[PDB]
Amino acid sequence: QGYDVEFDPPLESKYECPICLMALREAVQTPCGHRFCKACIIKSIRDAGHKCPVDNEILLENQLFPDNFAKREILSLMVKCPNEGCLHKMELRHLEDHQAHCEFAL
Amino acid sequence: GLPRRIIKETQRLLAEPVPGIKAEPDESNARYFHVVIAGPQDSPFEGGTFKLELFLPEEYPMAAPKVRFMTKIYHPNVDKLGRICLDILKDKWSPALQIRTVLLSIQALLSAPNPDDPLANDVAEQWKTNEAQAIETARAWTRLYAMNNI
Numbered sequence: 129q130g131y132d133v134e135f136d137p138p139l140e141s142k143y144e145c146p147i148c149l150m151a152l153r154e155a156v157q158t159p160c161g162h163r164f165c166k167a168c169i170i171k172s173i174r175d176a177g178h179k180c181p182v183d184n185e186i187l188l189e190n191q192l193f194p195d196n197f198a199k200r201e202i203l204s205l206m207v208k209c210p211n212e213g214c215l216h217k218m219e220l221r222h223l224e225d226h227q228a229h230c231e232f233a234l
Numbered sequence: 235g236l237p238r239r240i241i242k243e244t245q246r247l248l249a250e251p252v253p254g255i256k257a258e259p260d261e262s263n264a265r266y267f268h269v270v271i272a273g274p275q276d277s278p279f280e281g282g283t284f285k286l287e288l289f290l291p292e293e294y295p296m297a298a299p300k301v302r303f304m305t306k307i308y309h310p311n312v313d314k315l316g317r318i319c320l321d322i323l324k325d326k327w328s329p330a331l332q333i334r335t336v337l338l339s340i341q342a343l344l345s346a347p348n349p350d351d352p353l354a355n356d357v358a359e360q361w362k363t364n365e366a367q368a369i370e371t372a373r374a375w376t377r378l379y380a381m382n383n384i
């Protein structure tokens with residue numbers, strides 16, 4: 129459930145979600161310092177244990193800090209339309225808007 | 235048709251394969267992989283080519299990848315059916331671990347057996363008492379089952 133898109137330049141591994149391997153969507157950070165997509169670490173906590181998947185350290189859902197710096201810079205990254213065929217590229221922050229105007233789509 | 239996580243993870247392995255290990259998806263079902271691990275050096279399995287089958291359950295990455303040896307092998311962490319007794323594949327697994335993580339673990343397990351985590355009854359203990367004997371038997375099995383690269 130992260131951002132399944134081509135990042136060009138490629139996505140830096142610091143912004144990749146260990147759980148879904150996509151760019152962090154709604155980045156959050158754990159007390160232990162790891163980042164996930166807000167929705168992925170909740171999914172891991174709810175049915176995998178209240179531990180951080182990266183090191184099995186106790187985690188708990190009320191300890192997910194919004195990683196506002198990561199969210200900000202990931203949304204400013206250049207990406208390509210993931211509608212296969214389309215050849216449009218823009219700041220990830222705007223991908224969504226572009227969707228309402230894609231030649232390839234719904 | 236197959237989850238992006240599996241799709242992306244696959245490309246990375248084929249792209250940057252783990253040293254001493256060759257693994258490709260099933261040309262008929264991506265959830266299955268055909269693995270070949272070269273016996274570690276200085277280890278009892280030196281000079282042998284081992285085949286394993288790794289399968290990714292539907293609950294993956296929440297549930298661990300099931301792996302099994304296809305090539306017979308004398309080692310305290312593998313049973314007669316070829317099943318591997320390893321922590322990270324049982325309770326110590328995490329949706330954060332990957333296929334590469336499993337491949338690397340199994341390989342280290344050859345370079346140096348872990349006689350308890352838990353362990354496949356038999357060999358497990360024989361490797362404890364007559365470790366010299368256990369090792370010659372493993373070398374023997376390696377020449378017998380993993381030297382004709384079937």
Ligand SMILES: [Zn+2]
Pocket residue numbers: 158160161162180181182183184185
């Ligand atoms: Zn952690």
Ligand SMILES: [Zn+2]
Pocket residue numbers: 129130145146147148149150152153164165168
């Ligand atoms: Zn994620």
Ligand SMILES: [Zn+2]
Pocket residue numbers: 209210211214215216226230231232
């Ligand atoms: Zn488009």
